[PDB]
Design a protein around this ligand. Structure first.
Ligand SMILES: CC(=O)N[C@]1(CC(C)C)CCN([C@@H](CCc2ccccc2)C(=O)N[C@@H](Cc2cc(F)cc(F)c2)[C@H](O)[C@H]2Cc3ccccc3CN2)C1=O
Length: 386
């Protein structure tokens, strides 16, 4: 899986894209990696933030299916024209697949300026595919048409510092291994949590700690509505009654310093002199996830280094600045790209399970470290579901 290593680029706050070609002859695009939708869609008409876009008029294997499609995201939404065409991944499995492709004709707050991607690959399951589950998502088509196993995995890799458009193009930014696990991406063992159900990648969260302290809530409040792993999500999104309790902790604990109220709502940045950021006053966070054995479970611990998100200075100087990358949700938890940045993540479609290991890629400091640890024998698991 050497040929596959390092095939991502991008960062938490603008997305992790990978290169695909579509069409005959093949046309190149960077596609956003999004495990938290299921449409494969590419931009098709001119767009200020688009430096290239899919051109059907130009590909002899294109197939139009005379059907519209509207995809609303939580914020942002596009409109499109369903069709099919030949697809490949240059730095991925050595195959050509025919796949449903929405041609985006109209866009609102979807695309991201300087993000350097032009489509999105919904890596989730058919049930949530728009217009309807009859639209075979890209990975499904990938597996039915060839010999790639029914698993893919994501190592997403944040810098620990803000990166400019030059540098992100230039950075190696992560790996998508389509159809395999690769040993050089993580340390430790993989611990698996079951996928509850094949729509999103919905997991069950069992317990939450802040610097070892149990947030002490009703189980199901944590997974209220749903709990998903979403690489197409910038932050750790938490249900309001969980958010508020969580933020009360990190506030309690990081008490030695005083932060604007707006840093906590996620909007305003905070800065410290070059290299003097006090990671030490901030708590780590533990997500407890149900295990594959009945009434057994494990844990993922993430540092301020994953949840304080590096952003450029308020005038580009040598200060080190950040946004608080945990925010409110009224749709369940969303284990987003800053959390995912801490682990090697295996989407074992075949075994209905999701893999976690300490990423050979995460940002630590010499005193603490991201962890995947278990087993734990906490009770009351079997009805944390919603
Ligand atoms: C705001 C931010 O900083 N970053 C992004 C990520 C950018 C960096 C790539 C931008 C949008 N956004 C959230 C909304 C969060 C938010 C929340 C409140 C306010 C503002 C932002 C989001 O909708 N993500 C979708 C992917 C995506 C990428 C993209 F570029 C454009 C786009 F429209 C969509 C998922 O597929 C999603 C859909 C979904 C749909 C239904 C149920 C669950 C889920 C759960 N998963 C991020 O997290």
């Amino acid at each position: 899986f050497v040929e596959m290593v390092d095939n991502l680029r991008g960062k938490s706050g603008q997305g992790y894209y990978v290169e695909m070609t579509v069409g005959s002859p093949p046309q190149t695009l960077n596609i956003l990696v999004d495990t938290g939708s299921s449409n494969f869609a590419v931009g098709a008409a001119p767009h200020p933030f688009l430096h290239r876009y899919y051109q059907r008029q130009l590909s002899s294997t294109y197939r139009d299916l005379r059907k519209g499609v509207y995809v609303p995201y939580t914020q942002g939404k596009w409109e499109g024209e369903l069709g099919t065409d030949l697809v490949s991944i240059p730095h991925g499995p050595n195959v050509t697949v025919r796949a449903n492709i929405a041609a985006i004709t109209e866009s609102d707050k979807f695309f991201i300026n300087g993000s350097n991607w032009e489509g999105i690959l919904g890596l989730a399951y058919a049930e949530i595919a728009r217009p309807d589950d009859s639209l075979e998502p890209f990975f499904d088509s990938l597996v039915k048409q060839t010999h790639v196993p029914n698993l893919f995995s994501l190592q997403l890799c944040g810098a620990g510092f803000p990166l400019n458009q030059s540098e992100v193009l230039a950075s190696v930014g992560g790996s998508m291994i389509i159809g395999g696990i690769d040993h050089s991406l993580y340390t430790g063992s993989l611990w698996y949590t079951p996928i509850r159900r094949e729509w999103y990648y919905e997991v069950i969260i069992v317990r939450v700690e802040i610097n070892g302290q149990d947030l002490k809530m009703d189980c199901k409040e944590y997974n209220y509505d749903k709990s998903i792993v979403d690489s197409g999500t910038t932050n750790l999104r938490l249900p309001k009654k969980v958010f508020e309790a969580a933020v009360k902790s990190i506030k309690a604990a990081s008490s030695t310093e005083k932060f604007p109220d707006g840093f906590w709502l996620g909007e305003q940045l905070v800065c410290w002199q070059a290299g003097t950021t006090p990671w030490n006053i901030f708590p780590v966070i533990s997500l407890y996830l149900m295990g594959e054995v009945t009434n057994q479970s494990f844990r993922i611990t993430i540092l301020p280094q994953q949840y304080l998100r590096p952003v450029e200075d308020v005038a580009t100087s040598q200060d080190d600045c950040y946004k608080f990358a945990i925010s409110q949700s009224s749709t369940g938890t969303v284990m987003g790209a800053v959390i995912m940045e801490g682990f090697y993540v295996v989407f074992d479609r075949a075994r209905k399970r999701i893999g976690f290991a300490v990423s050979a890629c995460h940002v630590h400091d010499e005193f603490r470290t991201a962890a995947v640890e278990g087993p734990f024998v906490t009770l009351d698991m079997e009805d944390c579901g919603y």
